[PDB]
Ligand binder design. Sequence first.
Ligand SMILES: Nc1ncnc2c1ncn2[C@@H]1O[C@H](COP(=O)(O)OP(=O)(O)OP(=O)(O)O)[C@@H](O)[C@H]1O
Ligand SMILES: Nc1ncnc2c1ncn2[C@@H]1O[C@H](COP(=O)(O)OP(=O)(O)OP(=O)(O)O)[C@@H](O)[C@H]1O
Ligand SMILES: Nc1ncnc2c1ncn2[C@@H]1O[C@H](COP(=O)(O)OP(=O)(O)O)[C@@H](O)[C@H]1O
Ligand SMILES: [Mg+2]
Ligand SMILES: [Mg+2]
Ligand SMILES: [Mg+2]
Lengths: 68, 193, 54, 321, 298
Amino acid sequence: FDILCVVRDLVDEEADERLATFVVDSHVRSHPENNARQRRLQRQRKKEEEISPIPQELLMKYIHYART
Amino acid sequence: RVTLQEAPGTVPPGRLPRHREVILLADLVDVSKPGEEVEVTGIYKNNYDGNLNAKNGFPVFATIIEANSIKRREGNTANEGEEGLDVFSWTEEEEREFRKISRDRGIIDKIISSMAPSIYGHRDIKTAVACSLFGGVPKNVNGKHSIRGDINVLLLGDPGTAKSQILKYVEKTAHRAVFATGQGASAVGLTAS
Amino acid sequence: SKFSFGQATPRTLLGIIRLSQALAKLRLADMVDIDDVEEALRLVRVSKESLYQE
Amino acid sequence: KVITDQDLAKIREVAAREDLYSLLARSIAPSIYELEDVKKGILLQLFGGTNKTFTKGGRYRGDINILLCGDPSTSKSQILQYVHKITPRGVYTSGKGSSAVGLTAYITRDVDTKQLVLESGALVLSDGGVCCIDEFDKMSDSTRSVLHEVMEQQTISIAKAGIITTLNARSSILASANPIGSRYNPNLPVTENIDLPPPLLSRFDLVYLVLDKVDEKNDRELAKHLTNLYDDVLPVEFLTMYISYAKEHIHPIITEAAKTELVRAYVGMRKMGKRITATTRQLESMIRLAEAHAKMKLKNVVELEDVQEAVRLIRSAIKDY
Amino acid sequence: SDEINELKEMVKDEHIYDKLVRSIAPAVFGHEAVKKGILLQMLGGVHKSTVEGIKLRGDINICVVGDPSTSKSQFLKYVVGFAPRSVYTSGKASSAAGLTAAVVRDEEGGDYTIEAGALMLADNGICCIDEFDKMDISDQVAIHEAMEQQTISIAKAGIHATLNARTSILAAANPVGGRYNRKLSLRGNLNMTAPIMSRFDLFFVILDDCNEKIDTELASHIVDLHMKRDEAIEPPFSAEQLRRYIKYARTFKPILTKEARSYLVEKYKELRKDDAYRITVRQLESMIRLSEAIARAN
DNA sequence: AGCAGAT
DNA sequence: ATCTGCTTTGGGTGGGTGGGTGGGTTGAGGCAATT
Ligand SMILES: Nc1ncnc2c1ncn2[C@@H]1O[C@H](COP(=O)(O)OP(=O)(O)OP(=O)(O)O)[C@@H](O)[C@H]1O
Ligand SMILES: Nc1ncnc2c1ncn2[C@@H]1O[C@H](COP(=O)(O)OP(=O)(O)OP(=O)(O)O)[C@@H](O)[C@H]1O
Ligand SMILES: Nc1ncnc2c1ncn2[C@@H]1O[C@H](COP(=O)(O)OP(=O)(O)O)[C@@H](O)[C@H]1O
Ligand SMILES: [Mg+2]
Ligand SMILES: [Mg+2]
Ligand SMILES: [Mg+2]
């Protein structure tokens, strides 16, 4: 195994504060309720931009191109 | 000719799966391989079969599909919201920009950020996952020495620390991925039988 | 004690009477003599105890 | 190949008899000696308690499960054979026995026709009857799982070979058990000797410990009876017809006096103990046994005597067990 | 038209939340704490998937622990006979598949085939396991992924697949000892391990008391069940009424308000602080699930 | 070789 | 009425785009589940 990543769960009040805030904001973001196809794509893009600097589909194509 | 069978995911639980036969003419041969999910577009055709009539006792015909295209659905359950028969292919304009994104100075770290963004922290895990996804370069020195060129990662953590979610994301993003669980895998299930 | 093969049961009574009946059949007499029962008892005793005590 | 008004009148005439209970008990298995309590319990089991179809509530089983466990010397397969003979519906089986048809529904292939056929096992074929399992001790774990599902849900569910089906198995059980060693040790508890899970031997309505304690008088009497084998009794046909008539027509119901006596007896059996002497299972056992005793008299109502007889058998069963 | 009027009359009630809880499994007696959990499990939570294909669970898993003869199974029996899709099983499952799927191959040439288990058959339903504490090691391990990722991954000779197991588990277990011991903690009394225990949203413990008053009251009710038959059970809402409202509630997809968002973070902080290992990041999502379920009931 | 068909 | 022509048994001197609910059935070797 080239890389070993050990993960620990330690109760730090500030660390718990940030993680809970992020998780609740994510659950709010993923809620289903929150041209027609063009509008759907635009809203999905706006939602995605908030947490990922690069689009996921563009990232998949980029990784494949780099590996090829 | 290939024998298509209902995917276990779609067949109702506990029932037997139906199957059909697909005919792949030139340029479509060997695109699909055994044990893989696929999305076949073709023509539903029927012809006369004497043996089928003899066994059933009624004049029932035999039906087949004449493939017109194939899309590899394996390991892409989370990419169903995408056009084209290949979702990991590029136009001549999308690779004239994969080359602007990449001259910028911090791509090596905007790439690490874009790994499973719905997971809060774990920067080391995301870095390892990105490294494994891009992988090293295999090399055969003089045709005598073989050196591996891929990176293996192990996540050894506590219960609720977003490991399985990272594995699922890597399954989504990789070109060819297979997911296996501890006791659901066998010695010959992995490798070959 | 632990030496005993197994405590006697009604099966043993049925076996004893069965052996006595077979012995009487050999004797060719209807009336089952006490001698046949005694011989059957000796046979059951020597079946196991005779060699176990050795 | 090698019921009538008169039958009904004869049945009423026997029912009106003051000494009906001991009469049926004796007639069940004449050749057995001095096992009155066991015979009485088995007689109650044959009739079976009332079955309840409930709206706004789950189904409540009227069956009685009895475990006949003790030393190998005593007569236990005899009683199972007798019960099989009497029962209007039932099967005979031994756990881990290839000869028996099988306790669970299983998918097979017809050799004659080369087709797949779903074959019901012994438990399903005992629907409405008594399924006597001779060797309860030696059983496959899967068999002990299907038995748990039957005694709990009273149905067997099979979902293999493309088929998803459920089969009714509303059958009573009368099993027999033997000790781990060559004899039953009174010092150790029943559970250790029986070699059955507590979850399993907790489900029998009555557990009978028939032990062959060596006594001069008892051995004398048993030997005298056996050798002599070389109080009226009823023919088996009459007994089975009577049982079928009662089981098909009579449906006894509980009353306020019976409701008072049941509550009082359960409370008394709880207060005896901290050690838990009795559980809510004993209440269901008592009500079922009272219903069966009412059925045997062909009565449509459960009186104080029925509940009192049921407690006497249950308390005695809790007694040596 | 008539049924709709009934539905409106139901929602307008102000006791509605209490009435539904008191109308679950009327056969049992005096276990309102458990009944609230079962009702919330039927309504469930909102199922969400992130903007990158990561799935967040929306099913509530409940475990019930108690001494023998404490109506544990009576709760499972009601659910299977009431819930749309459900499957009653036991930890020591007889079939080869068990709680999860297994591969079985017919004689000679026949290739391997998947035989569904309990968790697969109860897809989109509720899977009731009668004795959780007796499960097999293969299923004990295999239940890890089913409860959280909602899939069963199998890679055997010639066959590999991911099988959907989107089910809510309602389990019943016995104490490690003969009876639940009040001195030890829930961890000590149970044979389950920490990773599983964190996968259950709720835990309920049912004890056995020897009080004379409670004993007489319980005995009376059981006998009246057989005596009066239907007349002994008069829940506020009949089975048909309750099943209709539950279907109506599940069409609601409540969201989290601004005030609740900040509030929900503070409560997790308090829960974590008191722990310092029951509480993990999962308990934060459990409160989101239960909050949605409670909202659906209203 | 017996039976199935075309001139 | 006469002339022209195909196909068996059962078996590999028909085969595996005919299959194994159309019969040719022991022997060995690999795999999952059971232990
Ligand atoms: N009334 C009786 N009391 C005790 N034993 C009896 C009685 N009547 C018969 N027996 C004996 O019991 C034998 C029949 O019982 P059986 O051999 O089936 O015993 P079991 O305890 O059921 O089982 P096992 O086969 O392990 O001995 C008869 O052959 C006779 O030996
Ligand atoms: N609180 C209660 N309310 C109503 N009935 C009860 C109650 N407690 C026990 N009972 C009665 O007890 C009978 C037997 O209990 P049951 O076997 O269902 O309990 P359990 O907890 O599932 O058992 P076990 O733990 O042994 O599996 C049930 O039929 C039920 O009628
Ligand atoms: N750092 C994190 N950021 C976001 N979500 C997290 C994080 N850690 C845990 N989670 C939550 O935990 C759940 C997944 O737990 P999982 O990784 O399956 O447990 P395990 O690590 O045992 O596989 C997800 O719903 C996820 O939202
Ligand atoms: Mg995991
Ligand atoms: Mg016997
Ligand atoms: Mg139970």
